[PDB]
Design a binder for this molecule. Structure first.
Ligand SMILES: COc1ccccc1OCCNC(=O)C1=CC=NC(=O)C1
Ligand SMILES: COc1ccccc1OCCNC(=O)C1=CC=NC(=O)C1
Lengths: 304, 304
């Protein structure tokens, strides 16, 4: 028993991290097969970031201008191309530590592990959720760009995020591995509105099921609700509307605990309307939304 | 910016994990050089765990009874010995993935990463603190025994914990890598009192400094206090007494932010006496104590 904000083991991803330098800028790259992926803003200087013309900036660059180093060994760059906001540097050597991998675009509300890196070296790993507004609340300092987010299913790493920037509000924005930003964000040093965020309702319910499985039950009540009634409360408290697809994904947790999804919704409704009254759930004094129903089942079953 | 409960990258530890089977029991082992370390309770059966005679149980076992498998390859056991509550199985092959390592006994209040494993396979990584009462609030299910805790300083892994059991209260107990339990715990299936736990005051203060560095400042007030006055409040709220050694370790964070340690103590005093009033600090609605002053500096500076 016990419940933790668990990240995937980062080993398979550590073996892919490289340092990429272009001029005076150094950031992180991901070396998979004979390609290194990194944010295209590695080609920018301070004067450029306000509104860089990436096509023009990249034209002044040659294969030899991109310095790629994997630990202490230098990789030979034989090609370069820009795909959306990522640069793909073709190298003459396939990464011998390349795991089985996929590039996936995750949905808002889904979770993933981030391996924060500096100068191509891993510093730490933490579990994140892609906010409904497509930002992530990470921990990234100068030099962290090119750090990636991923999920792991047995031996396959599904890369879903590459870190590009911190918005003036202190939240983080990045792209999928094809360089498409999550959300409306552009890779420019400008004020960018991130939409209204909401709490991931299906994840809070999954976390309430994790609480019951692990022994924290004080919040269970004698009430039930309907999807319509619950959604009126979800609206008032900036929670995502619950759909039948969300109820269906909560099926296994409802079956395991014997607590019907709408009964758990009624517990969540009471917690939203009355707060915690100074109590905690799974060591938290707020409603946790960065655990999906899949995460809860995985952690509660011990999937390796 | 941003602050997360970050774990160390687990790669160096994943390459050491093995499965150890003895009879019908399977758990995790740590393969370093030509030795595999695992909890000695791998030799027990259900009837034994109420009060096992480990010396007698181990005498009925031979090198060939310990099945050690690293992924898909079987290791040949050429020796076995019990040191405190750990078994050391000598194997004929040194682990080629053995990183630089140390065995350390951490102090209560210190933090470490845990790589939860099942059947010798890593499932996840999370950051823990050794509670003042020598328990850890982990996430471990059946089969997790032998999972380890560690810290990493550049290329050196300092192994500090090996998981042995879950107490009837749902908290976790384990040993250092020499098999000495942290706390009063014994490896028996019996009710075991874990002492009164307290909140790690120096860690809460370090986390308040992390909050100021990252922009959450609402809790800063116009007051100051003394170590004596603060400790009277710490006593009332089951917080560890603050010492000058704790103030000294907070020095770098006090210097970076310009907020004197006793002024931060006065903010903490007001938060203990008045609560959060429905606000959050670094995404938490409670006072966080699982970040040491070293962790805060490391995460705020980007040490890899
Ligand atoms: C506004 O900056 C940008 C806009 C578009 C593109 C790149 C930008 O930044 C490049 C350098 N940024 C960093 O190294 C970070 C510093 C702190 N926190 C982070 O998450 C990243
Ligand atoms: C009371 O059990 C023991 C006492 C002494 C020694 C060993 C004991 O357990 C062996 C198996 N335990 C597990 O696999 C766990 C199940 C669930 N949670 C965990 O943290 C471990």
């Amino acid at each position: 028993s016990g419940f933790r904000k668990m990240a995937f083991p980062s080993g398979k991803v550590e073996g892919c991290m490289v340092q990429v330098t272009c001029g005076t800028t150094t950031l992180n790259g991901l070396w998979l097969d004979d390609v290194v992926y990194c944010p295209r803003h590695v080609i920018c200087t301070s004067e450029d970031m306000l509104n860089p013309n990436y096509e023009d900036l990249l034209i002044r660059k040659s294969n030899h201008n991109f310095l790629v180093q994997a630990g202490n060994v230098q990789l030979r760059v034989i090609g370069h191309s820009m795909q959306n906001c990522v640069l793909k540097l073709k190298v003459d050597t396939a990464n011998p530590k390349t795991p089985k991998y996929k590039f996936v675009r995750i949905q808002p509300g889904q979770t993933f592990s981030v391996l924060a890196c500096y100068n191509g070296s891993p510093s730490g790993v933490y579990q994140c959720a892609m906010r409904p507004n497509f930002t992530i609340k990470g921990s990234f300092l100068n030099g962290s760009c090119g750090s990636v987010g991923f999920n792991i299913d047995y031996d396959c790493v599904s890369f879903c995020y590459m870190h590009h920037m911190e918005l003036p509000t202190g939240v983080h924005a990045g792209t999928d591995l094809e360089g498409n930003f999550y959300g409306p964000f552009v890779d420019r040093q400008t004020a960018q509105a991130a939409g209204t965020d909401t709490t991931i309702t299906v994840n809070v319910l999954a976390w309430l099921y994790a609480a019951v499985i692990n022994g924290d039950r004080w919040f269970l009540n004698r009430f039930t609700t309907t999807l319509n009634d619950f959604n009126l409360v979800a609206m008032k408290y900036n929670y995502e509307p619950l759909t039948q697809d969300h109820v269906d994904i909560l099926g296994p947790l409802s079956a395991q605990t014997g607590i019907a999804v709408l009964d758990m919704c009624a517990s969540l409704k009471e917690l939203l309307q009355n707060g915690m009254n100074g109590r905690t759930i799974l060591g938290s004094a707020l409603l946790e939304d960065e655990f999906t129903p899949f995460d809860v089942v995985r952690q509660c079953s011990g999937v390796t």
